[PDB]
Design an enzyme around this catalytic site. Structure first.
Site: not given
Length: 321
Positions: A139-141
């Site tokens: 999700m590359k949060i």
């Protein structure tokens, strides 16, 4: 604990293979046509698999998912999409699990339908967790500390993923609020973006430096210094790196500087990454410490079992060189 869950699984499968489960609109169209043509052969297998897993594990839309392939016309447009989307997911996992160390689900593919795809994503993680198979949400949060605790809840408490991807360009303090729950004294594993597979990735990761030490190495250093400040491994968890299979030179720099680092390497197959230079440069005697992600080359294959066996076999051979 993720460290021991990966070490274990690997003694079950002896591989590096991380399978990407990124279903798109053409997958669901294709799968629907495939099932029409084959008499719902795959969906029929899904009704039975993982020791009756749909009946016993799925809690969102179970009645829809249990519909006989030959009563689909009775469903709404929306329920119809939910049905094939979930079924496509279960078909991939049912067919490729015997070769998968971990599955990585990229969130982007699940959110564009609103609640329909989020419900499916929850079903997916529940189904995988039911078989103790290692999982990751890609999700590359990123956000500020107070805000990211929300993503910790979603990823690690609600989906109950084992791991996720994080972008720490804003800073490393965020890792404290994603990978650690103080009240629960619980740690969660993740992989931090170091070198990404997109063609213009050099623009900031390479061109930026502190005194000719390039950005991606700075970020790797800061990431590990934060992981050690956190004492994350005391709890048999880790913060690792994403280094793309097209970035084998960077791969060599990172594995040499950080020999015991857990690394995730996407871009094999569809993105035309190099498998041999990747594994050579990123090798670790403990195979789980270098996940080789393959997504569309497996999910878009006429025979995902066989495609996954291919990459599995490919890996077994490079290792023996």
């Amino acid at each position: 604990h993720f460290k021991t869950k990966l070490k274990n699984r690997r003694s079950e499968v002896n591989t590096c293979l991380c399978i990407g489960l990124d279903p798109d609109e053409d997958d669901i169209k294709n799968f629907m046509k495939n099932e029409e043509q084959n008499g719902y052969k795959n969906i029929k297998n899904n009704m039975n698999s993982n020791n009756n897993g749909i009946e016993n594990i799925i809690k969102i839309g179970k009645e829809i998912l249990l519909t006989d392939g030959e009563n689909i016309q009775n469903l709404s447009e929306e329920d119809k999409f939910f049905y094939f989307f979930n079924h496509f997911c279960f078909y991939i996992i049912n067919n490729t699990k015997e070769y998968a160390l971990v599955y990585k689900m990229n969130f982007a593919f699940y959110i564009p339908y609103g609640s329909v795809g989020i419900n499916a994503l929850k079903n997916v993680f529940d189904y995988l967790n039911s078989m103790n198979i290692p999982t990751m949400l890609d999700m590359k949060i990123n956000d500020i500390g107070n805000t990211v605790k929300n993503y910790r809840k979603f990823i690690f408490e609600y989906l109950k993923s084992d791991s996720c991807t994080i972008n720490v360009y804003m800073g490393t303090n965020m890792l404290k609020d994603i990978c650690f729950d103080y009240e629960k004294n619980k740690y969660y594993s993740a992989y931090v973006l170091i070198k990404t597979t997109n063609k213009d990735s050099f623009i900031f990761q390479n061109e930026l430096s502190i005194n000719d030490k390039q950005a991606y190495i700075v970020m790797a250093d800061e990431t590990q210094k934060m992981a050690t400040e956190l004492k994350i491994e005391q709890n048999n968890e880790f913060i690792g790196f994403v280094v793309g299979s097209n970035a084998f030179e960077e791969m060599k720099i990172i594995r040499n500087k950080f020999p015991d680092s857990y690394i995730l390497s996407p871009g094999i197959g569809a993105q035309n990454g190099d498998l041999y230079k990747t594994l050579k440069n990123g090798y670790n005697k403990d195979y789980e410490k270098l996940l080789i992600n393959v997504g569309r080359a497996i999910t878009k294959s006429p025979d995902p079992k066989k495609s996954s066996e291919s990459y599995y076999n490919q890996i077994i051979q490079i290792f023996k060189d």
